[PDB]
Amino acid sequence: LHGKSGTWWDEHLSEENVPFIKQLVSDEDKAQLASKLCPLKDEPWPIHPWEPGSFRVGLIALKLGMMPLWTKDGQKHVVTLLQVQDCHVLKYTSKENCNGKMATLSVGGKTVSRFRKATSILEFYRELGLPPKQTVKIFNITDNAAIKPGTPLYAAHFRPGQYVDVTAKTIGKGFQGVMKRWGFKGQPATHGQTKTHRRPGAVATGDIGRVWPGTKMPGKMGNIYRTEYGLKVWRINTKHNIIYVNGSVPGHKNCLVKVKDSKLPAYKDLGKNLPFPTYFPDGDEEELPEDLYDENVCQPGAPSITFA
């Protein structure tokens, strides 16, 4: 009665109009996604060649899960599958306004419902001509690697043998005690110990009469952004846009992770052979196989490896 009623899209729709609106908006979403499938025939920005010191954009993938993988030396590596789901370049800014001294590309992925987004976000995506994305991450790039907003990005943007950095929100474990959060030893279970088994001991010294900032104390654990560095790209399924990344990735299954070329010094100039701006399937220079493998990977369907 005060006028601040919170409305949702379905509230005033009839039984007939609800499925109609659902189907209409889904059709518009898929049409918009398909309209961006040929970036090279849509006035692409200049495609410069790779130079040393160039940083290209990354992707936003979805953590599918983990599976084993075997190398020709006979070792087992656990690998994590990251699916690139409707990842598009959304925004571009120059060095001056990038909050630093390097051009920036905002990239989104994992299309979400337009009915659940703020009006400003909906307007932004309407101007862009794309359905809204769940997460938008900013990638620092050199001007050589600028890509026109709206261009799709694919798993084949990376290649096997490359090293990658994956950043994501870790699994949230809620308010955790200090034993689980910081691996404190706690106190013994018996021998007179009463009502203190998992408690922090002293938290400071008596002299300072206070507790230092940054003291390890019980509190919220996880649900913060962490980066795993230097993970090898073992394989790329181009059909389903899957990247097989060595080892573990922060966060839970079906969570969006930001994937970018590794920043480690050892992998500083490994971008020579990588698609420099990005991979363009519309380029059609050579239709990539369904699966791109690293050299050492024991591919399934290969004859059983014999260490001869």
């Binding site: 899960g65 087992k76 599958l81 299954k253 490896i305 014999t306 260490f307």
Partner: protein, 217 residues
């Protein structure tokens, strides 16, 4: 029709696409290595290439005491005794370095896990290394070996008599008193077989997996 256990996924929030991809890899490996049908309790001989040696194969024969894992990482652990030394090896089914899996004796046991053979008498784990493979009729239900093993004295790896294990292949009457059995019954949990929301119905999932396998063929 026998669907190998690793194909049926454990329930969870994981995306079905991950299982489709994993099953594609599993079937594409099965096209190279024949993974025969076998159950916990069947005797297997596994030949695997050794990286420690130079292109030399190693053979291990034993009773499959556990099938576990799902997907490409599925394992089966099988047990034997060699010169009086009990040994178990956990073999990965889809490891590219297993050259061959032979079902020397296809049979099912009263239990879906024979981990209690560790505490059983060593005869129940002893199997001749060079035993010849038995033959089963093409159209024939898998035999169920109703053998009930005798156990060594009560200190065991696990409290096998507790109802949560649901062991049927142990002669408890020989090794435990009726008082001990009654005491073990305190952990009965009779409601647990009747809570309907705990059961995992895999009929549709198995049907879809069978369609995938047939398409792969």
């Amino acid at each position: 029709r026998f669907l190998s256990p690793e194909f049926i996924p454990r329930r969870g929030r994981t995306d079905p696409l991950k299982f489709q991809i994993e099953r594609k890899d599993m079937l594409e490996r099965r096209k190279v290595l024949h993974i025969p049908e076998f159950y916990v309790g069947s005797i297997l001989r596994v030949t695997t290439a050794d990286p420690y040696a130079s292109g030399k194969i190693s053979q291990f024969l034993g009773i499959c005491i556990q099938r576990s894992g799902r997907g490409l990482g599925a394992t089966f652990i099988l047990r034997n005794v060699i010169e009086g030394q009990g040994v178990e090896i956990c073999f990965e089914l889809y490891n590219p370095r297993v050259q061959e899996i032979q079902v020397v004796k296809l049979e099912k046991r009263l239990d879906d896990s024979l981990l209690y053979l560790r505490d059983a008498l060593p005869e129940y784990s002893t199997f001749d290394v060079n035993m010849k493979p038995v033959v089963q009729e093409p159209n024939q239900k898998v035999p169920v070996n109703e053998l009930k093993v005798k156990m060594k004295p009560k200190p065991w790896s696990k409290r096998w008599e507790r109802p949560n294990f649901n062991i049927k292949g142990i002669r408890f009457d020989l090794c435990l008193t009726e008082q001990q059995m009654k005491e073990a019954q305190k952990w009965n949990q009779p409601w647990l077989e009747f809570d309907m929301m705990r059961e995992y119905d895999t009929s549709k999932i198995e049907a879809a997996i069978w369609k995938e396998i047939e398409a792969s063929k």
